[PDB]
């Protein structure tokens, strides 16, 4: 039940796999990066293969495509982070524990790349994820949120799937639930 | 879908509240576990929570936790007292540690479940509504391997500090005779019943 472009895992559950620079995979992901980051240089890109994380995101993808219509739920966003969170993110993905109390993802790589988010290690090396997020139906964000707003406040059961800063042209995305985002690649880059 | 064979036909709907008959095995059992520690109260009704999406995502982790842990009994049956305003979201969307109320003696920021119904029947947790009712959930909780908790936790503590990202599944007030349990992740507990009592 896994992605068929994944490396054999030798009967293991977690695996980090570095891309070969000439590949279409490397250039597809790199072309997405170089749209808004032409200045930076990539040390590497690695495909994160997490069986359990994959499994649970997959489950929600279907629960979402069910619930909306079959709307276009999924987006490719970026998550810059500091070198020390990475081991956890690789393993357990993103955790929520201002447009809300949740996990932030950038439409553009230039945004995530801000040293505020993608923090240089002692070696000047920064980090950013290319994350598949289940965005589905969203609305505008505000400071207070612990969960996305319910569509109709007179039915506080159905919720939006995320929140944006502006709905006409969103530049970020916030999700408030475990397993709504699968980190697909890890870009290590340099000034 | 995955749906259990004892569930009422939801006829193509994803969430259902179903009223149990007292005479039934299912109703009496639940009853007998409530009356172990709670006699002075009385049961108005017992509803089975039939939530597909919750049941589905929950089960996936029950399996991932049966694999990952060497032949352990990962799943435990506990109580959750809550209030009239918190029933609807939960029935629909389960438990959320970010909405979690603080505990008198706190062992971690997350959602607390009780071994005895008495503790959960405290008006502190199960608050009576304007009609005087009290509500408690009967939850399937994945406790797995657990250590003692501390008030500073956000996720469980790691098994080996030198191996940080490897964590316990939950934490208890006491490992010898646990009376409470704390879980730190979505889909780690199934709200299987809603007891409304007095
Ligand atoms: C709060 C926020 C807003 C926009 C982008 C990001 C990001 O890429 N990484 C992190 C981490 N946080 C972000
Ligand atoms: C922190 C804690 C310890 C032991 C039990 C509970 C509980 O049953 N419900 C809750 C939910 S918080 C709440 N919810 C509604 C009314 C009062 N408090 N918390 C517990």
Curated annotation (Swiss-Prot), chain A:
Effect annotated for changing residue 79 to Y = Abolishes catalytic activity
List UniProt keywords, sorted A-Z: Glycosyltransferase, NAD, Nucleotidyltransferase, Nucleus, Repeat, Transcription, Transcription regulation, Transferase
Which positions fall inside the PARP catalytic domain?
A: 2-191
Q: Which GO terms describe its cellular component?
A: cytoplasm; nucleus
State the superkingdom. Eukaryota
Q: Does Nucleus show up as a keyword for this record? A: yes
Q: Which GO terms describe its molecular function?
A: NAD+ binding; NAD+ poly-ADP-ribosyltransferase activity; NAD+-protein mono-ADP-ribosyltransferase activity; NAD+-protein-aspartate ADP-ribosyltransferase activity; NAD+-protein-glutamate ADP-ribosyltransferase activity; nucleotidyltransferase activity; transcription corepressor activity
Major site of localization recorded for this protein: nucleus
Spell out the subcellular localization from the entry.
Answer: Nucleus
A single BP term in Gene Ontology? negative regulation of transcription by RNA polymerase II
Q: What family, per the record?
A: Belongs to the ARTD/PARP family.
Task: Tell me, in a sentence or two, what this protein's role is.
Answer: Mono-ADP-ribosyltransferase that mediates mono-ADP-ribosylation of target proteins. Acts as a negative regulator of transcription.
Q: What is this protein called?
A: Protein mono-ADP-ribosyltransferase PARP15
Please name the taxonomic classification of the source: Eukaryota, Metazoa, Chordata, Craniata, Vertebrata
Q: Which gene encodes it?
A: PARP15
């Amino acid at each position: 039940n896994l992605p068929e472009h994944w490396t054999d895992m030798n009967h293991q559950l977690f695996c980090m796999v570095q891309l070969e620079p000439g590949q279409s995979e490397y250039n597809t992901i790199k072309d997405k990066f170089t749209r808004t980051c032409s200045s930076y240089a990539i040390e590497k890109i690695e495909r994160i293969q997490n069986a359990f994380l994959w499994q649970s995101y997959q489950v929600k993808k279907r629960q979402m495509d069910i619930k909306n219509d079959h709307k276009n739920n999924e987006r490719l966003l970026f998550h810059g982070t500091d070198a020390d969170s990475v081991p956890y993110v690789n393993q357990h993905g993103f955790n929520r524990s201002s447009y809300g109390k949740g996990t932030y993802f950038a439409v553009d790589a230039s945004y995530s790349a801000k040293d505020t988010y993608s923090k240089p290690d002692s070696n000047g090396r920064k980090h950013m994820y290319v994350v598949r997020v289940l965005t589905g139906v969203f609305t505008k964000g505000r400071a207070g949120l612990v969960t996305p707003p319910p569509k109709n406040p007179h039915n506080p059961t159905d919720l939006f799937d995320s929140v944006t800063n502006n709905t006409r042209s969103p530049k970020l995305f916030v999700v408030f639930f475990d397993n709504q985002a699968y980190p697909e690649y890890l870009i290590t880059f340099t000034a």
